[PDB]
Structure formats: structure tokens, C-alpha cells
């Protein structure tokens, strides 16, 4: 006999049994012991025995469940665990907008998504009796509901909730379900969506542990750091639903019917799911990409809306941040120097049946790549590059396998020793990658003296040139220490693809509906007053509480924008420690596909260089039609070769490319090209570059330093502010998403 809960601090003054299993159930009365599940939920010792004791009628149900539990879950099976999983009644919320009260469902009703979707106060099964005229919504809500939102309610919930039939479950079978907030007694998505880490997996980009909270999740929800189970389950559920339907804004309304767990804790679960949703939204994990809203249904609570920002530059970073902030409900104006949007995304659509980027067009690693997500949203297909790239010599001969394999081995071995050499070196000891490679190569011929043929030397030149393409620089200017610094962080895994409709489709959709001022080069930014004043080159003024600069590295280096107060000497040192790399592209349309015989379907072919100085002159040719019907080749100018080309006119560059193509296909006539372009990014005044790299003496840390906001007022995005993902449209886009989150919080 007792009317008191076993649990010190429990706020229940009148414990009732929710089980009502035993014929001798204490109900609201006396029992030898009241078992505490939560502050609103207890069960009597008679019902405990009903399930727990061998001679009692519920022992069969308990032991059946217990065996299942023991071979699925990691957590000890208990009568409490049992009660919470199997016997605790369900709570559901009334669907009427003017009511919205929480109601307990009778002990035998199982909650389903459909019931949650449609429930109304006092809903009974079909009946032939005329319904009473009563109004069930005016019935008073159980007093225990109020208590759930108190911070202390959760601290007195004995066992964390465990979701049933979570959309996230299929993706997480490798884990103990209870360890990721899923019930151990349970049980056509885009192949580029792999949001959850798996056991023994290597690091991959934009991946979360389903069983561990990320740093920012700890920061935002410190009350779940000791007990992450409920948070994890909901976050995992939220990511599962977003990727399941990335074409719509994911809302608490659509998450609710998918939260299925017994007891008052379900109320707490749906309360939290809302906050976790907005957090994941602000951070750019969901409700992002090219999703639009459009026209008055913003993605963050009104609390965020009263604030204004100016974004400088309408490239991928600028538009990503602008898209996010606009979607949040924030006021956004964008100022762009040129007479078009896109920056280093600029597509030529004038070729027959094909789109050719003058700038970016490849996606490097589509797994969890926001470009892949955005293609999904737009219904865009991407062409996965095949592996084969034959090294064709002037003139005509395909480099033999054993020669190819051999020199590949040797080129990569030189990189191995660069890696060995740099291990304990400081910035002051850095040397150019090109110089270091030469140094090791020379000592290699010396120490072993294994002369390579002229051709073997040239094949090696092809690999060196491929590095110059990657860095946008002659190797003599790239840091041996830091050239591949980003690979410290998990990188984008899986396919490289050609973005067949071009990045401009994504660029255009991101910009759709935004206030963008073209031909408005910013000349000065003053963040001395109460808000920032930004002035264009013609004197036009704009003002906002915040400003985001996304202009290219080369323009920061030139100092084309005056900052008042000036940027720190530390920022400037970072800015000048990075290289503004450059490549250029040529694209060529022909009457017919003359390479088809020798190339045989490959997406690209390589060009063995005749000499070191020319190694960057069209090292690789790209077949710009995956369907293999049209006839367009693209190629790249890199390294020492871009300098060799700046005083040449388009016709000359074209003649050299044709000279090359004719050498590569000497076993035939090659038709003249009927259309072409040659890019001049190097001398485009507002761009002046292709992509950043680390100069000798420099550090990956420069990316972080450039990314550092100033006084929570001046923000920075762009490919040269992304340490994990430098250079790319994806890195630039992600840097904009990064900044929009920082700006929305401040």
C-alpha cells in the first residue's frame, strides 16, 4: 500500500496505472510499488507482475517480445522498456485549427500515420446510432500535457523514446536500432543521396553520423548531449524525409504523422521536431538547393525576417546565399559588376544540340553533392564519365599499356616522396611542387639511373600538366606542402559527371525572383556607421544591416573594393598567400565525328606533349555529346601555356588546336571546325581567374581566414573561402549556404 511514486522528484501527486492489465490492477489506488515511466505515466506492481512473472498471464507476451528485443537491440530488456514499447497508450493531436488539443487514445488503439493525419476530438469508429450533438473539442485537455514542455519533464523520463517505422530505418540497419532512437521490435531514392555514415566507411563529404551529434548540434541543443537518442532519431528522420522528397518544403505538418511512439513523450517529440527542422533549414541541410518560396511561405519563423543584407557578386556563392536568405524571409539585394549573372558559370547554347560551358561544367563527386540534389529537383540528368582516357601521341599512336602503366607508377611515386618530404616542414621551408618533383626525379635517375625513353619522359609531362590543370597554375608556383591541403577533410565521393544542360540552368533557377542589380560594380563598402553603406562605381548608394562579399580572389587581391575600416593585415596576408589560378577553354564544332573510329566511345582522350614547355596546350580533349550524335570537342589551356596564349588572337589559338588535332589523328583527314570559342577569363576585369590554389609558402588556413566575418556585419563567401571544398561551383555554393546560416543567426 502506497500512493507515492518510487521516483524522487516526480511531480505526480496522484499516480494512476496506464497498464490496467492485471485483474488486480491498482488503478488510481494503493500498491506495494508504483513504477515510474515519466511524470504522467506509472504502472502498478500488479501489472508489473502480470507481464514479468512466469505464472502470470502476460509472461508469454513479455518473453516473446524480450527474445526479439535481445537479438535486435543493445539495451537491456525491462518491464519498463516493454511498457514503453508495447503497452503505453498513444497520444494524438486534434486536427482542427481552432482546437489543436492533445488527446489520449484508448489502450488498444494503435496510432498510425493516417490517424495522426486526420484525427479530431472524440473520433469514434463507424456507428448506426445518431451522434450526440456535443462538441468534443471544448472538452478540457488532460493536465499532464502542459507538463511535457517543461525542461525538467524530459530529465525525468526514464527511457528515451524509440520511434516505430521511421523512414530512416532502412538506411540504418547496420546500427543497433535503439542506439539511433528506433524501436528494436520493428520490421527508390536517388543513388547520390547517402546522408548517413556506415560502419567501416571512409570519410565522405556532407555525411552525418546517425548515432553521434555533430558539433553544431551539440552547441544548439546542449540539453541532448548526455542523452542524444531522441534528437538523433528526429534529425535522422528529418534527413530521411527531405531526401525522400526534395522537391517540397519539409514542414512540421508533414513530419508529424511519421513520428510514431507511445506515451506523452510523443508530444515532446513533435514539439522538438519543429525546432530541429528550422535548425536544419537554417544550416542548409534541408529545404535548400533550388527549392523556391514563393510567394509568402517563408522557411524560418518570422523572428528571423526583420533584417536586411546586401550581397556582392551574383556567381554561385552569391546566389546560393541570396536564395537561402530570401527563402528564410530575410531581405536581400544583390549587386553584380557585369551585365549577367553566373560569374565563372557562363554557358554557350549556340552549338547544335548541346550546351558547352565556357567556365564550369563538371561535377567532381556527386555523392551528397548539392549539385546532384539540385539536378534531382529540376529533373536534370548528368552524364557519368567513363574511366578510359588513352594517351595519344603526335602523331596517331596510342601509348602502349606497359609504357602507360609504368610511367603512371613512377609519376605517383614522385608524389609519394613529396608527401614524405613535407611531413615535418614549416611554411618557411616550403618549396614549389614543380621544383621538388624535379629534385626527386633527378636524384632518382642518379641513385638508380634507369633512363627513360623520350616518350616515357613525355608521358610523365602529361601527368605534370594534369596537375597544372587541377591547380590552375604552372607547378613552379604551387605549394609542395599545401597543394592538396583540402584532402585533410572528407571529400565528395563517387561519380564525376558532365553537367549536360550546363550549370546556367541551376544558376538561373537560384536567381529566379531575387532582386539583382546588374552592371553595378561595388567600389566602396563602409561599415563604420549603424549599418553598412555600399557604393557602386557610378556613385549609386545602397544600405543594409549586413553585407556579404563573394567576389573572386583576384579582385580581393587587386583591392578593387575599398573597405572602411580597411581589412586586417592578417586577412590581406591570407588573401595574398593564395594563388589566383587560371585555365582557359576552347570548344570546336565539326561537320561530323572524326574521332569515333579511334576514340571508341571514351568521354575524353589525352594528348602526349612533345615538350615540357607545351605540356599545358590541350593535354585533354572532351567529347561534349554523351549521346555520341553531335560533334563538339572541348579542350583546356593550362600551366605555362596560358601565358603563351594571352597575346594570341582567337584564330591563332584555334590554328594551334587544329594543328594538334591533325597530329593526333594523322591517320586521316580532319575536317575544319565550323564554330568555336576561346575563353579569356584571365583578362575578364571582374573575374581574372578560373580557381584558387595554394601558393608556395601558403596554407590551407588562408581559406578560413578569408572566410572570417568582420564584427558580425561583413561576411565573405566564394570558392576561395572554402577550405574543405575549394575551387568548385559546389564549394562556392556551399560557402554561400554557410554564410546565409551565419547571417540568419546574428
Amino acid at each position: 500500500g502506497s500512493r507515492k511514486c518510487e521516483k524522487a522528484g516526480c511531480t505526480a501527486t496522484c499516480p494512476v496505472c496506464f497498464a490496467s492489465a492485471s485483474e488486480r490492477c491498482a488503478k488510481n489506488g494503493y500498491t506495494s510499488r508504483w513504477y515510474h515511466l515519466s511524470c504522467g505515466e506509472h504502472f502498478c506492481n500488479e501489472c508489473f507482475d502480470h507481464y514479468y512473472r512466469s505464472h502470470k498471464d502476460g509472461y508469454d507476451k513479455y518473453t516473446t517480445w524480450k527474445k526479439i528485443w535481445t537479438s535486435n537491440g543493445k539495451t537491456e530488456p525491462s518491464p519498463k522498456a516493454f511498457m514503453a514499447d508495447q503497452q503505453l497508450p498513444y497520444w494524438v493531436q486534434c486536427t482542427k485549427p481552432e482546437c489543436r488539443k492533445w488527446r489520449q487514445l484508448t489502450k488498444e488503439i494503435q496510432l498510425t500515420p493516417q490517424i495522426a493525419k486526420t484525427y479530431r476530438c472524440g473520433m469514434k469508429p463507424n456507428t448506426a446510432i445518431k451522434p450526440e450533438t456535443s462538441d468534443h473539442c471544448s472538452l478540457p485537455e488532460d493536465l499532464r500535457v502542459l507538463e511535457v514542455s517543461n525542461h525538467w519533464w524530459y530529465s525525468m523520463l526514464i527511457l528515451p523514446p524509440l520511434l516505430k517505422d521511421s523512414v530512416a530505418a532502412p538506411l540504418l540497419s547496420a546500427y543497433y536500432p535503439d542506439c539511433v532512437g528506433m524501436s528494436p521490435s520493428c520490421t527508390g531514392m536517388n543513388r547520390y543521396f547517402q546522408p548517413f555514415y556506415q560502419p567501416n566507411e571512409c570519410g565522405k563529404a556532407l555525411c552525418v553520423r546517425p548515432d553521434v551529434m555533430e558539433l553544431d548540434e551539440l552547441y544548439e541543443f546542449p540539453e541532448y548531449s548526455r542523452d542524444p537518442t531522441m534528437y538523433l532519431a528526429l534529425r535522422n528522420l528529418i534527413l530521411a524525409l527531405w531526401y525522400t522528397n526534395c522537391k517540397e518544403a519539409l514542414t512540421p505538418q508533414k513530419c508529424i504523422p511519421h513520428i510514431i511512439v507511445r506515451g506523452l513523450v510523443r508530444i515532446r517529440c513533435v514539439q522538438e521536431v519543429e525546432r530541429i527542422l528550422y535548425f536544419m533549414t537554417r544550416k542548409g541541410l534541408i529545404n535548400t538547393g533550388v527549392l523556391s518560396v514563393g510567394a509568402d511561405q517563408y522557411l524560418l519563423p518570422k523572428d528571423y525576417h526583420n533584417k536586411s543584407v546586401i550581397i556582392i557578386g551574383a556567381g554561385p556563392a552569391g546566389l546560393a546565399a541570396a536564395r537561402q536568405l530570401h527563402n528564410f524571409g530575410i531581405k536581400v539585394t544583390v549587386l553584380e559588376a557585369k551585365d549577367r549573372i553566373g560569374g565563372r558559370v557562363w554557358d554557350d547554347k549556340s552549338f547544335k544540340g548541346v550546351t558547352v560551358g565556357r567556365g564550369a561544367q563538371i561535377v567532381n563527386g556527386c555523392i551528397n553533392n548539392p549539385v546532384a540534389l539540385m539536378c534531382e529537383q529540376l529533373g536534370i540528368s548528368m552524364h557519368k564519365f567513363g574511366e578510359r582516357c588513352d594517351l595519344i601521341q603526335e602523331g596517331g599512336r596510342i601509348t602502349d599499356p606497359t609504357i602507360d602503366k609504368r610511367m603512371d607508377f613512377h609519376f605517383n611515386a614522385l608524389l609519394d616522396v613529396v608527401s614524405e618530404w613535407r611531413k615535418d616542414k614549416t611554411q618557411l621551408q616550403d618549396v614549389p611542387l614543380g621544383e621538388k618533383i624535379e629534385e626527386i626525379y633527378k636524384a632518382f635517375i642518379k641513385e638508380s639511373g634507369i633512363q627513360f625513353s623520350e616518350l616515357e619522359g613525355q608521358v610523365l609531362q602529361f601527368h605534370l600538366s594534369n596537375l597544372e590543370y587541377a591547380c590552375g597554375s604552372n607547378l613552379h608556383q604551387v605549394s609542395a606542402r599545401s597543394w592538396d591541403h583540402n584532402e585533410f577533410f572528407a571529400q565528395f565521393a563517387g561519380d564525376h559527371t558532365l553537367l549536360t544542360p550546363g550549370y546556367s540552368v541551376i544558376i538561373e533557377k537560384l536567381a529566379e525572383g531575387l532582386d539583382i542589380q546588374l552592371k553595378s560594380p561595388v567600389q566602396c563598402i563602409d561599415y563604420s556607421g549603424d549599418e553598412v553603406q555600399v557604393t557602386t562605381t557610378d556613385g549609386t548608394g545602397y544600405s543594409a544591416q549586413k553585407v556579404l562579399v563573394t567576389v573572386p580572389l583576384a579582385l580581393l587581391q587587386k583591392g578593387a573594393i575599398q573597405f572602411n575600416p580597411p581589412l586586417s593585415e592578417k586577412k590581406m596576408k591570407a588573401i595574398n598567400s593564395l594563388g589566383a589560378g587560371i585555365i582557359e577553354k576552347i570548344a570546336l564544332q565539326f561537320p561530323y565525328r572524326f574521332w569515333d573510329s579511334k576514340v571508341q566511345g571514351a568521354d575524353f582522350f589525352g594528348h602526349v606533349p612533345p615538350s615540357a614547355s607545351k605540356r599545358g596546350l590541350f593535354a585533354v580533349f572532351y567529347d561534349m555529346d554523351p549521346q555520341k550524335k553531335h560533334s563538339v570537342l572541348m579542350s583546356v589551356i593550362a600551366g605555362e601555356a596560358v601565358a603563351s596564349v594571352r597575346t594570341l588572337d582567337d584564330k591563332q589559338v584555334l590554328q594551334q588546336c587544329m594543328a594538334t588535332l591533325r597530329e593526333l589523328f594523322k591517320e586521316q583527314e580532319v575536317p575544319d571546325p565550323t564554330k568555336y570559342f576561346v575563353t579569356r577569363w584571365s583578362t575578364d576585369p571582374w573575374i581574372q581567374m578560373a580557381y584558387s590554389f595554394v601558393k608556395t609558402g601558403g596554407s590551407g588556413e588562408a581559406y578560413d581566414i578569408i572566410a572570417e566575418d568582420i564584427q558580425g556585419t561583413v561576411f565573405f563567401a566564394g570558392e576561395a573561402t572554402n577550405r574543405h571544398f575549394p575551387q568548385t561551383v559546389t564549394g562556392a555554393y556551399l560557402s554561400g549556404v554557410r554564410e546565409a546560416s551565419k547571417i540568419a543567426a546574428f
Binding site: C202, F411, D416, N466, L467, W483, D484, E487, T728
Partner: peptide, 20 residues
């Protein structure tokens, strides 16, 4: 950076593969 390479990716010089 090495991550920009598509055709003929280099492979040498990489830190020891990291697992969970």
C-alpha cells in the same frame, strides 16, 4: 587541388585512409 582532376586522376601522395 587534386580533387579538380577528372580524366587520369593522380593517386600518389595521399594520407593513410581514415575509417570509422
Amino acid at each position: 587541388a587534386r580533387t579538380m582532376q577528372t580524366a587520369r586522376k593522380s593517386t600518389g601522395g595521399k594520407a593513410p585512409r581514415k575509417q570509422l
